[PDB]
Scaffold this active site. Sequence first.
Site, PDB file in Angstrom:
ATOM      1  N   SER A  16       0.841  -1.190   0.000  1.00  0.00           N
ATOM      2  CA  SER A  16       0.000   0.000   0.000  1.00  0.00           C
ATOM      3  C   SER A  16       0.876   1.240   0.000  1.00  0.00           C
ATOM      4  CB  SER A  16      -0.870   0.013   1.270  1.00  0.00           C
ATOM      5  OG  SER A  16      -1.789   1.096   1.287  1.00  0.00           O
ATOM      6  N   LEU A  18       3.188   4.350   0.225  1.00  0.00           N
ATOM      7  CA  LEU A  18       4.582   4.607  -0.144  1.00  0.00           C
ATOM      8  C   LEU A  18       5.305   3.306  -0.460  1.00  0.00           C
ATOM      9  CD1 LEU A  18       5.540   7.311   2.486  1.00  0.00           C
ATOM     10  CD2 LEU A  18       4.434   7.600   0.254  1.00  0.00           C
ATOM     11  N   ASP A  37       4.143  -7.586   4.649  1.00  0.00           N
ATOM     12  CA  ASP A  37       3.019  -6.768   5.077  1.00  0.00           C
ATOM     13  C   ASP A  37       2.056  -7.676   5.833  1.00  0.00           C
ATOM     14  OD1 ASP A  37       0.657  -4.867   4.945  1.00  0.00           O
ATOM     15  OD2 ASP A  37       1.871  -3.825   3.417  1.00  0.00           O
ATOM     16  N   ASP A  57       3.997  -9.564  10.431  1.00  0.00           N
ATOM     17  CA  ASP A  57       4.048  -8.383  11.269  1.00  0.00           C
ATOM     18  C   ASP A  57       5.520  -8.048  11.502  1.00  0.00           C
ATOM     19  OD1 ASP A  57       4.014  -6.630  13.525  1.00  0.00           O
ATOM     20  OD2 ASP A  57       2.323  -7.678  14.380  1.00  0.00           O
ATOM     21  N   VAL A  58       5.907  -6.816  11.180  1.00  0.00           N
ATOM     22  CA  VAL A  58       7.314  -6.409  11.296  1.00  0.00           C
ATOM     23  C   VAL A  58       7.819  -6.478  12.729  1.00  0.00           C
ATOM     24  CG1 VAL A  58       7.396  -5.004   9.222  1.00  0.00           C
ATOM     25  CG2 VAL A  58       6.720  -3.938  11.406  1.00  0.00           C
ATOM     26  N   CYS A  83       8.778   0.670   5.139  1.00  0.00           N
ATOM     27  CA  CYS A  83       7.614   1.542   4.967  1.00  0.00           C
ATOM     28  C   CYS A  83       6.438   1.167   5.863  1.00  0.00           C
ATOM     29  CB  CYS A  83       7.127   1.598   3.505  1.00  0.00           C
ATOM     30  SG  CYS A  83       8.293   2.345   2.371  1.00  0.00           S
ATOM     31  N   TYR A 157       3.415   9.386  17.668  1.00  0.00           N
ATOM     32  CA  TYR A 157       3.885   9.315  16.297  1.00  0.00           C
ATOM     33  C   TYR A 157       5.257   9.970  16.179  1.00  0.00           C
ATOM     34  CZ  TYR A 157       3.653   9.239  11.213  1.00  0.00           C
ATOM     35  OH  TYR A 157       3.912   9.007   9.883  1.00  0.00           O
ATOM     36  N   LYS A 161       8.941   8.358  15.238  1.00  0.00           N
ATOM     37  CA  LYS A 161       9.682   8.811  14.061  1.00  0.00           C
ATOM     38  C   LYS A 161      10.971   9.518  14.442  1.00  0.00           C
ATOM     39  CE  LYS A 161       6.742   7.249  11.010  1.00  0.00           C
ATOM     40  NZ  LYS A 161       7.200   6.211  10.057  1.00  0.00           N
ATOM     41  N   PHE A 190       1.534  12.956   1.917  1.00  0.00           N
ATOM     42  CA  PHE A 190       1.404  12.147   0.713  1.00  0.00           C
ATOM     43  C   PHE A 190      -0.002  11.583   0.602  1.00  0.00           C
ATOM     44  CE2 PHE A 190       5.335  11.555  -1.677  1.00  0.00           C
ATOM     45  CZ  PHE A 190       6.181  12.336  -0.908  1.00  0.00           C
TER      46      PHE A 190
HETATM   47  N1  LIG Z   1       1.310   9.207   3.763  1.00  0.00           N
HETATM   48  C1  LIG Z   1       1.821  10.237   4.433  1.00  0.00           C
HETATM   49  O1  LIG Z   1       1.378  11.399   4.316  1.00  0.00           O
HETATM   50  C2  LIG Z   1       2.956   9.967   5.385  1.00  0.00           C
HETATM   51  C3  LIG Z   1       3.627  11.042   5.977  1.00  0.00           C
HETATM   52  C4  LIG Z   1       4.735  10.812   6.771  1.00  0.00           C
HETATM   53  C5  LIG Z   1       5.155   9.522   6.988  1.00  0.00           C
HETATM   54  N2  LIG Z   1       4.485   8.495   6.425  1.00  0.00           N
HETATM   55  C6  LIG Z   1       4.957   7.099   6.751  1.00  0.00           C
HETATM   56  O2  LIG Z   1       5.168   6.411   5.551  1.00  0.00           O
HETATM   57  C7  LIG Z   1       5.014   4.995   5.801  1.00  0.00           C
HETATM   58  C8  LIG Z   1       4.036   4.417   4.813  1.00  0.00           C
HETATM   59  O3  LIG Z   1       2.701   4.806   5.199  1.00  0.00           O
HETATM   60  P1  LIG Z   1       1.696   5.001   4.013  1.00  0.00           P
HETATM   61  O4  LIG Z   1       1.309   6.424   3.912  1.00  0.00           O
HETATM   62  O5  LIG Z   1       2.257   4.310   2.831  1.00  0.00           O
HETATM   63  O6  LIG Z   1       0.426   4.228   4.574  1.00  0.00           O
HETATM   64  P2  LIG Z   1      -0.350   2.917   4.166  1.00  0.00           P
HETATM   65  O7  LIG Z   1      -1.300   2.674   5.265  1.00  0.00           O
HETATM   66  O8  LIG Z   1      -0.825   3.075   2.754  1.00  0.00           O
HETATM   67  O9  LIG Z   1       0.757   1.792   4.136  1.00  0.00           O
HETATM   68  C9  LIG Z   1       1.300   1.219   5.340  1.00  0.00           C
HETATM   69  C10 LIG Z   1       1.447  -0.256   5.102  1.00  0.00           C
HETATM   70  O10 LIG Z   1       2.097  -0.816   6.262  1.00  0.00           O
HETATM   71  C11 LIG Z   1       1.436  -2.013   6.606  1.00  0.00           C
HETATM   72  N3  LIG Z   1       1.665  -2.292   8.016  1.00  0.00           N
HETATM   73  C12 LIG Z   1       1.193  -1.611   9.107  1.00  0.00           C
HETATM   74  N4  LIG Z   1       1.563  -2.124  10.259  1.00  0.00           N
HETATM   75  C13 LIG Z   1       2.319  -3.230   9.896  1.00  0.00           C
HETATM   76  C14 LIG Z   1       2.978  -4.218  10.652  1.00  0.00           C
HETATM   77  N5  LIG Z   1       2.950  -4.270  11.991  1.00  0.00           N
HETATM   78  N6  LIG Z   1       3.659  -5.175   9.978  1.00  0.00           N
HETATM   79  C15 LIG Z   1       3.624  -5.175   8.645  1.00  0.00           C
HETATM   80  N7  LIG Z   1       3.015  -4.312   7.824  1.00  0.00           N
HETATM   81  C16 LIG Z   1       2.385  -3.353   8.519  1.00  0.00           C
HETATM   82  C17 LIG Z   1      -0.023  -1.775   6.239  1.00  0.00           C
HETATM   83  O11 LIG Z   1      -0.761  -2.981   6.137  1.00  0.00           O
HETATM   84  C18 LIG Z   1       0.122  -1.017   4.913  1.00  0.00           C
HETATM   85  O12 LIG Z   1       0.136  -1.870   3.769  1.00  0.00           O
HETATM   86  C19 LIG Z   1       4.574   4.858   7.260  1.00  0.00           C
HETATM   87  O13 LIG Z   1       5.741   4.651   8.051  1.00  0.00           O
HETATM   88  C20 LIG Z   1       3.996   6.238   7.566  1.00  0.00           C
HETATM   89  O14 LIG Z   1       4.068   6.509   8.963  1.00  0.00           O
HETATM   90  C21 LIG Z   1       3.416   8.685   5.631  1.00  0.00           C
END
Ligand SMILES: NC(=O)c1ccc[n+]([C@@H]2O[C@H](COP(=O)([O-])OP(=O)(O)OC[C@H]3O[C@@H](n4cnc5c(N)ncnc54)[C@H](O)[C@@H]3O)[C@@H](O)[C@H]2O)c1
Lengths: 246, 243
Positions: A16, A18, A37, A57-58, A83, A157, A161, A190
């Site tokens: 999903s 990023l 994932d 699960d990571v 990610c 959060y 981070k 994003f």
């Molecule tokens: N989208 C933004 O605006 C934004 C901004 C800053 C940081 N981020 C960070 O970027 C990263 C990607 O988030 P995203 O926006 O792509 O969101 P997203 O929800 O689209 O993707 C996150 C993915 O991580 C998986 N995931 C969650 N917990 C998990 C676990 N314990 N084990 C395995 N997989 C797990 C989810 O199933 C999902 O597929 C995250 O670290 C998020 O905190 C995103």
Amino acid sequence: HMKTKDAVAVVTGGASGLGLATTKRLLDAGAQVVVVDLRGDDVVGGLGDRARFAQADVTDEAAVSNALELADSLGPVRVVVNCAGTGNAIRVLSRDGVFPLAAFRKIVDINLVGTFNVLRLGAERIAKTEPIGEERGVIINTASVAAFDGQIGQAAYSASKGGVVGMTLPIARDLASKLIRVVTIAPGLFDTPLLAAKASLGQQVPHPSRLGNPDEYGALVLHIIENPMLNGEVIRLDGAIRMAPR
Amino acid sequence: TKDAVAVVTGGASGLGLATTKRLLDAGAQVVVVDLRGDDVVGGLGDRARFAQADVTDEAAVSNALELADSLGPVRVVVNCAGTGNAIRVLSRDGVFPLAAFRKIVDINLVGTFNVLRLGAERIAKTEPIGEERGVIINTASVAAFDGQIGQAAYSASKGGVVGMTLPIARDLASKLIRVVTIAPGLFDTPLLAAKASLGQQVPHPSRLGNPDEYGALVLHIIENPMLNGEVIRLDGAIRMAPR
Ligand SMILES: NC(=O)c1ccc[n+]([C@@H]2O[C@H](COP(=O)([O-])OP(=O)(O)OC[C@H]3O[C@@H](n4cnc5c(N)ncnc54)[C@H](O)[C@@H]3O)[C@@H](O)[C@H]2O)c1
Ligand SMILES: NC(=O)c1ccc[n+]([C@@H]2O[C@H](COP(=O)([O-])OP(=O)(O)OC[C@H]3O[C@@H](n4cnc5c(N)ncnc54)[C@H](O)[C@@H]3O)[C@@H](O)[C@H]2O)c1
């Protein structure tokens, strides 16, 4: 494409957002990719025969190790991208109560501990490879502008981070003699399912005045892989935004 | 990158030359702005031009930008011109001279602002291509953060480049011009004209940077619309010690 063609990448959260955009960029660059994932096998199954899905699960070392056996079976592991993550937005104090300790722990566990877990186990797999020239591989982590600009509600959060940011340099130093670079990207806003009013959000970004496209994150991941001098650094990818308290 | 015009200060040597080559390979026309190097730039072919200018001289910089504008829309400006310095605050022969501090600040900080402001004026006149008019990339140094003994003026100048990056990005945002700064660590250029042991102190890769790696990052910044208002260390994870 020395560190991608004929090499294997592991992308957590790769089904999903990023992570998915990164997976696609890595496949387009010739890598085989193991997506790690909680879910998303159907999406990954549409990406062709150089992609594989591992349910893990990571935060679970046995499940991550099993995913890494799959990755190693495909070829030398040279790229790990963290990610996977989640968020919350909870005030420290509210009429309903104090920010719950378990909620803080959970966000820290997934975002910070989970990233370290995949980093440490992935590094072990990269370290046993033969160098290609001067490099064995590279590990890329996802922080957030919240590591620097945390808003009201972001205590957990931002803690998580900020931990990813803080560990980037010591880990790069620690893995340097084994020829593994470690770099962290700090994304701004994003357009991903994490944001599941979005238009007014993008207007707050100075330029470009829109939400980021996940492919722009994936492009930076690929540049880090391809640029041997990027190491031990955090890169904001954010349209020059600085997040206000609200 | 194709069809666009780029201006690279310091483009006849070192990081600027490697950037010029990368931009030419990407299809751009490039005006190199430098104190010297007509011969070097003449070997780069028909899409490269040389404009002699001190970056602190606004008439000479304007003349270079007139040449650039005559080739097409100016969309990229890269500030690589600069000079180094190593003088202790206090030493046997006296105090760090004020004129020496001023000179380094003038070349590295004022010269970068001079080319940035005049370049932004040209970029702003172009029509947007999609959502962007152009991008300005500056060169700071890890010395903006890790300044060593002897680097008072060098670090002051490069800290100024860092400090102005965000306000300028904010200022130019409505005109669709991004502003990003690269902070290089140790690179094998004529600036370092002992080098083997220096490279050994870089964690990984344990060598001096190749100028082409700087040029590659410049091109990524050009191609990645979300990079803006940021400083990127390009340094092999080094942190410079006092000596
Ligand atoms: N989208 C933004 O605006 C934004 C901004 C800053 C940081 N981020 C960070 O970027 C990263 C990607 O988030 P995203 O926006 O792509 O969101 P997203 O929800 O689209 O993707 C996150 C993915 O991580 C998986 N995931 C969650 N917990 C998990 C676990 N314990 N084990 C395995 N997989 C797990 C989810 O199933 C999902 O597929 C995250 O670290 C998020 O905190 C995103
Ligand atoms: N090489 C490194 O290790 C290193 C490290 C950190 C930062 N930097 C910075 O990178 C930039 C590029 O330096 P380099 O290593 O390529 O050195 P370099 O000496 O090879 O190139 C600098 C170029 O700038 C030109 N120049 C100097 N003063 C000028 C002026 N007033 N007007 C116009 N042109 C002028 C020089 O003639 C030369 O061609 C500089 O800003 C330098 O401070 C270099």
